[PDB]
Amino acid sequence: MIREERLLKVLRAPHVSEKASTAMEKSNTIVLKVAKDATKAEIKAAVQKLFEVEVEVVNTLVVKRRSDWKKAYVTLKEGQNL
């Protein structure tokens, strides 16, 4: 299933973009910069271990720019740290 060196690389940054603020304060959901491959199953596995929170669902999309950057919307349960 997992090898930790991959979880440490599957996430690349947090992402701040106004709808990223409204994703949290309205809809218990955090917005991330993830690997150019990744997959939703790995993105959930990375957040649930690095950030110690339960995850409900992960949805993904891309900026359509030269570096083809993968955004992830990770929805949490009820309470969160950051």
Numbering used by the authors: 1 to 82
Give the authors' words.
A large fraction of cellular proteins likely start to fold cotranslationally in the ~100 Å long exit tunnel in the ribosomal large subunit, before they emerge into the cytosolic environment. In E. coli ribosomes, portions of the 23S rRNA and a few universally conserved proteins line the exit tunnel, Figure 1A. The tunnel proteins uL4, uL22, and uL23 consist of globular domains that are buried within the rRNA, and β-hairpin loops that protrude into the tunnel. These loops help stabilize the tertiary structure of 23S rRNA and contribute towards the unique geometry of the tunnel. uL24 and uL29 are located near the end of the tunnel, and a hairpin loop in uL24 forms a finger-like structure that partially obstructs the tunnel exit port.
The E. coli strains HDB143 (uL23 Δloop; uL23 residues 65–74 deleted) and HDB144 (uL24 Δloop; uL24 residues 43–57 deleted) have previously been shown to be viable, as is a strain where uL23 has been replaced by a homologue from spinach chloroplast ribosomes that also lacks the β-hairpin loop. Compared to WT E. coli ribosomes, the tunnel volume increases by 2,064 Å3 in uL23 Δloop ribosomes, see Video 1, about 1/3 of the size of ADR1a (5,880 Å3) calculated by the same method. The initial model for uL23 Δloop was built with Coot, and improved by energy minimization in a solvated dodecahedron box of explicit TIP3P waters, neutralized with chloride ions and using the Amber 99SB-ILDN force field. Even after minimization, the backbone of the new loop formed after the deletion of residues 65–74 still showed improper geometry and Ramachandran outliers, so we used kinematic sampling to model alternative loop conformations, and then we selected the loop that could fit the electron density and had the best Ramachandran score. The additional space available in uL23 Δloop ribosomes makes it possible for ADR1a to start to fold at 3–4 residues shorter linker lengths (Lonset). Assuming an extended conformation of the linker segment (~3 Å per residue), ADR1a folds ~9–12 Å deeper in the exit tunnel in uL23 Δloop ribosomes than in WT ribosomes.
